[PDB]
Amino acid sequence: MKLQEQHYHEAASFLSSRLPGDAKTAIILGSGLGELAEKIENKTVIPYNEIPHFAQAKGNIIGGILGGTPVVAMQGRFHYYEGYSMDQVTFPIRVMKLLGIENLFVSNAAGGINTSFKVGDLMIICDHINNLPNPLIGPNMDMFGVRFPDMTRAYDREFIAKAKGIAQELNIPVKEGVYVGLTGPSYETPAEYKFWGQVGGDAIGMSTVPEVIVARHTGIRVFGMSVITNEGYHFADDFVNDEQDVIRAANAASEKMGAIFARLIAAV
Amino acid sequence: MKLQEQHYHEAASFLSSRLPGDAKTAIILGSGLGELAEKIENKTVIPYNEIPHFAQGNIIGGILGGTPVVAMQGRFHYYEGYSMDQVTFPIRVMKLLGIENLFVSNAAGGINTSFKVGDLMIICDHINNLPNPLIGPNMDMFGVRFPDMTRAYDREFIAKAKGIAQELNIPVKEGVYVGLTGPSYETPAEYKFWGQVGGDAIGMSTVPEVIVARHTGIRVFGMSVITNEGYHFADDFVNDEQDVIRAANAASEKMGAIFARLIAAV
Amino acid sequence: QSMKLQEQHYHEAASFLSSRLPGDAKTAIILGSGLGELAEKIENKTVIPYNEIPHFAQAKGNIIGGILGGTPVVAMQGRFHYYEGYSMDQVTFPIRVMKLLGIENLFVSNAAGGINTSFKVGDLMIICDHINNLPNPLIGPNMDMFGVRFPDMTRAYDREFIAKAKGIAQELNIPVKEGVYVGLTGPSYETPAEYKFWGQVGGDAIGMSTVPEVIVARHTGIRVFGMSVITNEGYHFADDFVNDEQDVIRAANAASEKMGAIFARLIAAV
Numbered sequence: 001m002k003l004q005e006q007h008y009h010e011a012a013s014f015l016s017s018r019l020p021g022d023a024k025t026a027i028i029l030g031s032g033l034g035e036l037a038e039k040i041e042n043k044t045v046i047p048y049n050e051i052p053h054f055a056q057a058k059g060n061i062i063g064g065i066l067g068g069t070p071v072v073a074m075q076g077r078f079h080y081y082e083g084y085s086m087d088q089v090t091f092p093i094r095v096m097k098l099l100g101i102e103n104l105f106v107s108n109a110a111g112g113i114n115t116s117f118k119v120g121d122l123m124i125i126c127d128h129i130n131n132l133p134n135p136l137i138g139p140n141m142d143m144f145g146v147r148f149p150d151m152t153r154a155y156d157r158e159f160i161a162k163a164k165g166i167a168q169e170l171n172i173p174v175k176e177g178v179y180v181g182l183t184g185p186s187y188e189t190p191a192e193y194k195f196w197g198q199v200g201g202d203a204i205g206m207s208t209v210p211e212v213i214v215a216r217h218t219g220i221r222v223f224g225m226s227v228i229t230n231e232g233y234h235f236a237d238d239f240v241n242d243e244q245d246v247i248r249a250a251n252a253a254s255e256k257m258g259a260i261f262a263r264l265i266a267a268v
Numbered sequence: 269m270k271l272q273e274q275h276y277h278e279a280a281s282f283l284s285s286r287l288p289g290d291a292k293t294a295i296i297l298g299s300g301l302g303e304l305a306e307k308i309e310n311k312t313v314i315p316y317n318e319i320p321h322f323a324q325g326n327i328i329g330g331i332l333g334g335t336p337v338v339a340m341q342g343r344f345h346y347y348e349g350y351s352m353d354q355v356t357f358p359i360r361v362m363k364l365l366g367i368e369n370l371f372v373s374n375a376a377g378g379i380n381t382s383f384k385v386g387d388l389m390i391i392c393d394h395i396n397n398l399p400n401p402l403i404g405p406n407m408d409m410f411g412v413r414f415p416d417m418t419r420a421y422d423r424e425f426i427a428k429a430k431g432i433a434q435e436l437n438i439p440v441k442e443g444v445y446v447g448l449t450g451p452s453y454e455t456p457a458e459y460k461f462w463g464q465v466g467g468d469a470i471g472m473s474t475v476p477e478v479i480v481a482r483h484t485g486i487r488v489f490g491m492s493v494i495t496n497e498g499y500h501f502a503d504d505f506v507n508d509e510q511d512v513i514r515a516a517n518a519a520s521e522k523m524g525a526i527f528a529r530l531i532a533a534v
Numbered sequence: 535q536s537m538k539l540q541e542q543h544y545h546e547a548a549s550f551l552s553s554r555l556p557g558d559a560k561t562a563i564i565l566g567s568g569l570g571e572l573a574e575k576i577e578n579k580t581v582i583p584y585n586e587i588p589h590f591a592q593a594k595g596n597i598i599g600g601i602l603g604g605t606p607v608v609a610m611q612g613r614f615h616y617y618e619g620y621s622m623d624q625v626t627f628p629i630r631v632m633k634l635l636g637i638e639n640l641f642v643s644n645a646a647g648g649i650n651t652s653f654k655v656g657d658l659m660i661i662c663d664h665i666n667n668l669p670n671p672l673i674g675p676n677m678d679m680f681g682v683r684f685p686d687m688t689r690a691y692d693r694e695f696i697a698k699a700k701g702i703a704q705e706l707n708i709p710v711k712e713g714v715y716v717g718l719t720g721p722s723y724e725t726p727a728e729y730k731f732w733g734q735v736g737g738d739a740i741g742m743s744t745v746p747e748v749i750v751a752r753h754t755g756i757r758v759f760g761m762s763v764i765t766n767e768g769y770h771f772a773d774d775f776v777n778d779e780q781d782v783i784r785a786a787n788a789a790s791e792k793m794g795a796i797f798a799r800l801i802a803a804v
Contacts, residue, residue, distance in 0.1 A: 148507070
């Protein structure tokens with residue numbers, strides 16, 4: 001109760017004494033943003049293992065300038081499939097709030113479950129379906145937000161419009177769709193992929209949804225994109241999903257996805 | 269196992285010596301029943317915090333239109349951090365008191381376009397998307413390992429309720445309640461999904477109690493106040509707890525009238 | 535650290551079993567519903583009670599080694615269900631022990647409620663795919679000794695085994711169905727709305743087991759064959775219909791001869 005509040009304050013205080021303190025946007029460097037940390041100038045690098053109460057995982061907080069703009073980046077992320085509690089997965093988001101972060105940008109890798117979404121496509125996330133445990137289960141922390149937060153437009157529409165404009169300017173094709181969050185860590189069966197596609201999902205991944213719920217609970221505006229890293233449909237007789245193939249697609253998308261996120265930061 | 273049994277008995281004993289003892293119907297005073305407790309006569313009020321093993325709210329014993337009732341004022345939700353054992357503990361205590369019928373109301377978001385704000389929905393079935401409350405060693409004293417859920421919502425109660433509503437000139441809807449944990453409200457994609465697969469309203473309660481009631485052979489009647497519409501979202505629409513409560517409060521007179529008459533009819 | 539201790543537990547269970555079993559089995563069978571006559575068909579049995587095997591979940595249950603359908607086998611008589619309160623680690627622990635024994639193939643049966651109107655009480659369904667609605671058993675740090683962090687599940691139910699089983703069923707004149715198994719936790723049976731939902735999104739039968747073991751088997755490269763006995767129909771409910779564990783058991787028992795005949799012929803073919 002009071003201990004929980006204290007833990008948030010301790011992490012925030014530790015980071016606040018170290019970071020530039022001018023960032024208003026935080027970015028989770030998920031799949032597809034693998035080139036972005038290198039682009040941050042005048043880096044202050046703070047290992048996760050040094051920050052009070054951050055889950056034991058590299059993992060670094062990186063402060064600096066990206067796209068001409070102050071940023072805080074989360075290099076490394078905590079996934080529910082790794083055994084972290086939802087409190088651990090989402091702890092850094094509430095720390096960002098205490099630092100004065102107003103906006104959260106996030107990327108991830110996802111399997112396409114709508115046939116218009118192909119390997120290598122970059123999908124702006126317009127909505128999600130949560131099939132992981134809700135991270136807000138437990139006593140409400142009033143310091144962060146209300147008991148029953150609204151999720152009608154969890155993915156900020158103005159950020160979406162700006163990102164579409166940026167993609168057009170940069171001549172980068174983008175798709176837009178619904179992200180379905182599952183725990184994993186096994187990839188889905190064809191029956192599962194089909195089910196989620198049938199009920200309106202466009203891509204499926206194992207992250208992001210918990211952070212988005214927690215961000216929205218505390219009023220942070222969210223922009224998210226998925227790299228479509230694999231196609232969960234039209235399976236060849238010998239098709240196998242493979243982490244190295246997912247990473248191949250994530251790596252291949254990083255330049256262009258990174259260009260969008262880097263241009264978006266100054267626009268928000 | 270034997271300690272669990274003790275705990276149920278300890279809570280039941282505590283209430284047993286403090287309540288009249290003839291009540292056959294229990295009521296969870298959820299959203300839409302906010303005026304009913306006032307109408308209970310010859311009240312015995314027992315705070316939850318005094319009842320052995322109740323999660324850390326009142327039990328109200330009394331007479332509602334000539335009929336002895338036990339009412340639960342305040343309820344435990346999974347989104348609060350309670351275990352399912354804690355959420356549903358009072359239902360098993362009710363069974364030990366000789367309760368035969370459970371009446372329950374809740375607030376729910378409409379996910380079928382024929383369910384609108386202010387509508388009173390008789391629950392005819394549910395879809396459970398919370399953890400099943402019976403996971404764990406079966407409590408043989410309460411029921412069997414694999415309880416049937418074919419007609420979890422008693423058909424005779426539904427018929428009676430419909431007759432009562434017609435008589436009182438209160439329109440009612442009937443439909444499927446989908447239970448989710450919350451506590452955040454759903455996204456449009458989630459609302460659309462649950463509507464697509466046959467849900468009519470979505471809420472964050474009730475399902476665990478109904479599973480536990482049916483496990484021990486308690487007959488169930490449930491209604492939802494449709495407190496918000498999870499469809500056709502305006503560009504600036506936001507869900508808001510105070511607006512949900514507004515609809516619950518506005519529904520309380522008429523919903524309470526139905527429940528009060530049903531209590532007398534069973 | 536914690537990995538060390540977990541690896542040690544699997545090794546302890548496997549060492550205990552390997553000092554006692556014949557050691558020639560490549561196929562293990564979970565004796566679920568529909569296989570209630572199969573243990574008696576195993577010849578030259580070595581019976582090892584679960585309560586003697588290091589780290590097997592507490593309760594009867596036995597590992598049985600011997601010969602079935604002319605072929606070495608290890609059978610799991612008794613299984614652990616998530617609805618009983620076991621962790622997924624406990625539910626699936628025996629599967630990883632099988633891997634350490636050199637088991638390459640896992641055959642599994644279960645009971646399930648039909649949710650496609652083509653699937654009727656007493657039908658024998660070859661499982662061609664599943665939908666998992668129980669907690670994923672691999673959540674937690676990955677055990678590299680068993681498999682990779684993100685295992686593929688594209689053909690969790692081996693297509694070659696399915697083809698062999700269909701051929702066997704034809705030869706033996708036993709009709710079979712084929713379809714998608716939906717795994718739910720239970721332990722309460724589903725509501726009609728739930729049965730309808732799962733049917734709508736492509737499930738053919740619903741049960742409370744099997745999926746966790748299949749995920750863990752595939753994580754460690756074990757080839758899987760599964761069948762469900764359709765023990766009840768989760769559709770077209772009569773006004774007075776009730777699901778009943780006793781009716782499920784009767785149907786499972788009634789299917790056991792023909793289901794067992796398929797599994798016994800399949801073991802030599804794989």
